[PDB]
Amino acid sequence: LPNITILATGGTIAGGVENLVNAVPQLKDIANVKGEQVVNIGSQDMNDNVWLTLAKKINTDCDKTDGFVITHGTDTMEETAYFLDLTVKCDKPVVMVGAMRPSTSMSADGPFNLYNAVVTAADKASANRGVLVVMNDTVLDGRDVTKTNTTDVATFKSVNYGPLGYIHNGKIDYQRTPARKHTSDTPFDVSKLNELPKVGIVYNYANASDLPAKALVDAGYDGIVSAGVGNGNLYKSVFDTLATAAKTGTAVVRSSRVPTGATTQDAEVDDAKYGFVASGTLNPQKARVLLQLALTQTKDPQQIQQIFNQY
Amino acid sequence: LPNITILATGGTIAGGGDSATKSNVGVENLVNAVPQLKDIANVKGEQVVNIGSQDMNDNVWLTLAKKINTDCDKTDGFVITHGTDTMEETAYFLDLTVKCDKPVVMVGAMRPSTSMSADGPFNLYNAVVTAADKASANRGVLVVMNDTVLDGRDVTKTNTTDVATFKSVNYGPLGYIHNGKIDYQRTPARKHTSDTPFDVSKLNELPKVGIVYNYANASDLPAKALVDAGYDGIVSAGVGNGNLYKSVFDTLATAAKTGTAVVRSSRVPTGATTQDAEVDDAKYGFVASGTLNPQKARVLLQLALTQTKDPQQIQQIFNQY
Amino acid sequence: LPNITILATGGTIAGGGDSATKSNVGVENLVNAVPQLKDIANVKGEQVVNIGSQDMNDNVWLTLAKKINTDCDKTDGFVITHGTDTMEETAYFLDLTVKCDKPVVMVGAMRPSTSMSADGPFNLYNAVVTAADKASANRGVLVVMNDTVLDGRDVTKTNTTDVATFKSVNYGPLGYIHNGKIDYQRTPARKHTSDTPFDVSKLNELPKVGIVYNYANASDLPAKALVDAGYDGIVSAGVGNGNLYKSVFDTLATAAKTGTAVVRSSRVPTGATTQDAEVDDAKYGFVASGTLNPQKARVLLQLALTQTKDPQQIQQIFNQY
Amino acid sequence: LPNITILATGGTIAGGVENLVNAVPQLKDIANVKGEQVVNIGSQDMNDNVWLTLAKKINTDCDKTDGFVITHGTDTMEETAYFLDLTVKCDKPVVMVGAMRPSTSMSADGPFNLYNAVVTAADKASANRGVLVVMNDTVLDGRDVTKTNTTDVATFKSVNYGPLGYIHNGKIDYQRTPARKHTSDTPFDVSKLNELPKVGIVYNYANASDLPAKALVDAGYDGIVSAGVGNGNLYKSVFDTLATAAKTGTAVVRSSRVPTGATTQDAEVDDAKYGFVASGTLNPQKARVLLQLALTQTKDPQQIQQIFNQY
């Protein structure tokens, strides 16, 4: 059976980490499982330092195991998954998993989610598909996956392009793979980084204040992601503040608060005139992930736009 | 035929039929752009304001509510043409502040009126059908898009470009439109229009309420900037079931005990931010938004703050409207 | 605490808590498999029948309706445990024939009770919560699955394996359940339970109604076989908005003028099969099903045929229930 | 500009076929369009003879054009699309398109759907993705696409695995391609066939009659697809009739009336014992398509099951 490493970032999702094989004994029939506690935080407190720790650990320990499962809180799992999708260089499956119900609650979803995550990490067909999220019997790619509902066990969906495969009786039928470049096909190399460029997110809505945007600019933030209205549009005072900042060198990415679809180039904002970048199907928190990593390579809006077109 | 007033807030959502007859109009041309409006209503148009909906603001909201409430006895129903980007916010504001019980229907277009297969003309026709239907009364303010009647509280823009973008993502639509007929199977249970206490006829401004986003390694600077500006309320677009990044939590905990109303909503597009989850709202003086997303929670918080600053009373408001 | 009766129609959807105490139950063990039922209700269980729901039939339907109507005054609410494959059919049959106004809630499980992360226990808990809630009365027969309360008319199985499969795909759910509390925001407008004329207490059989599928190059032999057997009604699972393959159309046109009731439904999983579309129903004597899918249209057609054979009166029934 | 052939099977969807460039003049700016009327029927009357005509025409005329657009009624478009997905051997885009509103109705969707279908057929990136359906600004694969709503212009969706790309301003961002084998990677060759094996569909529901199933068996049908309940289950009397028929050599495929998900092997029916085949994510009408073509190659249930696992 394959050697699978479980990297935990918080509390247990079934039934500490070295006792998962006794909480889910059926794991022993599909893998030899070894567990390590990397951090212990709630995922609402996820941060850049944990991201760097996780990427470096996977890239360092790749040769010591056949696949990785990362147990993670659901709140920010979609952000961590995409960060690792862009920075992991390991050739072996990396699978993120969580639980929408507490492990001690009735009909807890964690045990079977963990089982199916280990199935996915052990499947030779899972390799070269990027970093994966496995939730509710489904294999999802780290780029498009997002939390769609605040409480449903079925909350995680790839809302623009769909799942990669479904799991039944411990077997996966993969019918899709992400076309955007991931893992060893990206230039992002965080092995020597102690920190990431500073990128914040501002919301747009009727009568929106420019004060949040101005505060990030005044703090010297390297980039700002706009959660715009509709197809990435901005309330006038927010636009004005971000347009001035882009002329001073702040990177500005237009995303959307709208939960599906793409913030497109060639719409109602002349991005080239203002020095802005359109996020495509990346939602604001995912756009932040790629913008931070883009800013490790370049500050030029045309080159950042090309990054947002390839990854 | 019913008298229907169209209130325009921006550009035309339907064009055509405007060839001149003299050798030598705007909203008044809609009866020529969509000539079959004649079959279903007596239409009169007024241009209230002309702005893109990404620049929607409190002043336009107050103008619309006051106009509808003042002109209720002069017409049988209202249609408001509005940009799609913030329609869901205006719809809910009017849902809470309109006291006319005659139908008020909002409508827009996801394709330009000059484009191939423009959706505006048929959307406008169906909006007038809805405003003319006696069965549409007493259901609150409505949004009519893509052959569907949606209630103003739950309706939201779900896709950046699709003509089918507007959905009531938690509780579903009220009715579907086919061949100019509506089969209504639902009505909102939350209190609306004349069953709310919100009365803005005499108000010239609304309490200041801003929105902050949560994500990994979120800065507290947006929240701090609102607090420094003396904002009356702050809505948090939380992660998951309304949770907060530690730095943002710290600032909002301070703000809630120092005279700021704090509502926990969620960046997650469906589902409720609940009480009795993983944030002790009673300890911190916070309010949970329920199924109201951040921009909709801002609407209700602004209006709540015209009545009260007490967090327990604001929570009751968020449990009733 | 309310008295809640559980009527089981098959295997247990929750297990455990059954260790013996003597050195030397089935549905009666559910209070041990889900011990927190004690916190919310006084539960008594009866095994009505024991079958897989793919073998559901008219006799079980009649038994359930009669039992609920007979035992209504002996309890405060009912929960029916049922297989998922045909739950949506039984739910609608009971929605039309139950005359008790106390809550009747159906519940099932998409994972075996012995499996990892089995959904049955929490589904049953939430079903009892719903049946015990005074607010659940007068909303018709309900289905409670995956923390959601769904009305029996619109609820359908949308996925072959997902625990979240049951959805009200046209008009949405009535309420969501969190921490043992329901926030109801909707109720069905179509007439149900004591507002219908359908009374099956004295009936030992139901009219014969079959379903035929439409597709490219569809054979007329299924339809002809029903007609030859003297079926009282035939439901067509049409293509698109209720359309029929030419050979099937020919047979059903003949059947409708020769004493068979013919209802046009659709294999398409959401939306209505409408009147005034591309099938002249008046000319052919057909009835359009609206949002009722084929198996749900069969339920209403069977019951319509206990009252009338007249296609105009059956159409009115399909417009009211 | 590319040469695009429009093959019409019914009435016009914009504004006969030789006049589409004047109904949608913007087509002239993206392609040189030539139109042919192959048949003129409503798609509710679609049939095997039209399917054979279309496949042979595309395979014969492949060298004479750069891509194909087929105008088709929406009712059975998902069946024709999958038939062609399995039988077209041409290396050039084949794109199906229709309209949910009449061409003479307000806000008719046909004109822009046709424009976007020609965009897709002209895009070099559309090749080698199988037969496509283009509806409501979206490119969908012929296998998974299905009509989800009776009237909505947005009705067509790939409900299990998602779309291949979205179209904005005449440009497509493809992020997916079907993994199941299609077009020139299948063995199905209809170039010399005058007819297809007889395959019918029976519905399952409470108290279901076995008489439809028995009628198809008595007519000597080569195959029967069951629209089962849940995960492909059958009402007892239908099961019994189909089990007896399978022992006599009738091919029997279990599908489901449930609109998403897979009728799986290793569930509540012992397919190997009874000689049945599980359809996977193919719905009943799509399962019929593949079963008919399977039966041109083999009558053995294990070999038919392998076909349903590869195509």
Numbering used by the authors:
A (entry chain B), D (entry chain B): 1 to 15, 31 to 326
B (entry chain A), C (entry chain A): 1 to 24, 30 to 326
Manuscript excerpt for this entry:
The bacterial enzyme is capable of deaminating l-asparagine and, with reduced efficiency, l-glutamine, to their corresponding acidic forms releasing ammonia. The functional protein is a homotetramer and each monomer (A, B, C and D) consists of two α/β domains connected by a ca. 21 amino acid-long random-coil. The molecule includes 4 active sites, buried at the intimate dimer interface and mainly built by residues located in each protomer N-domain, as the companion C-domain of the intimate dimer contributes only one residue to the catalytic centre of the enzyme (E283′). Each active site consists of two parts: a rigid one, mainly involved in substrate binding, and a flexible one, carrying two of the six residues involved in catalysis.
Here, we report for the first time the structure of E. coli type II asparaginase in its ligand-free, open conformation (APO-EcAII) at 1.6 Å resolution with clear electron density for at least one protomer active site flexible loop, comprising key residues involved in the enzyme catalysis. The asymmetric unit (ASU) comprised 4 monomers named A, B, C, and D; chains A and B and chains C and D are associated into separated intimate dimers, each representing the functional unit of l-asparaginases. The electron density (e.d.) of residues 16–30 in chain B and of residues 16–31 in chain D was unavailable, which was consistent with most of the available structures for l-asparaginase present in the PDB. However, a clear trace of e.d. was visible for the whole loop in chain C, though with a slightly lower quality for residues G16 and G17, and for most of it in chain A (missing residues: 25–29). Compared to the closed form, the active site flexible loop has been captured in different, open orientations in two chains of the new crystal structure. In chain C, it is partially bent towards the α1 helix and its residues S23 and G28 form contacts with residues A38 and N34, respectively. In chain A, the loop is even more open, and residue T21 forms a 74.5° angle with the position of the same residue of the l-Asp-bound monomer. Apart from the active site flexible loop, all the other structural elements and the catalytically relevant residues of the APO-EcAII are superposable to the corresponding elements in the EcAII-ASP structure. The oxyanion hole described for all the l-asparaginase structures solved in complex with both L-Asp and l-Glu products, which is partially built by residues contributed by the loop in its closed position, is not evident in the new APO-EcAII structure here described. Analysis of solvent in the APO-EcAII active site pocket reveals the presence of five highly coordinated water molecules (for reference: 408, 412, 446, 529, 592 in 6YZI chain C) that interact with residues involved in l-Asp binding and are present in all 4 protomers of the ASU.
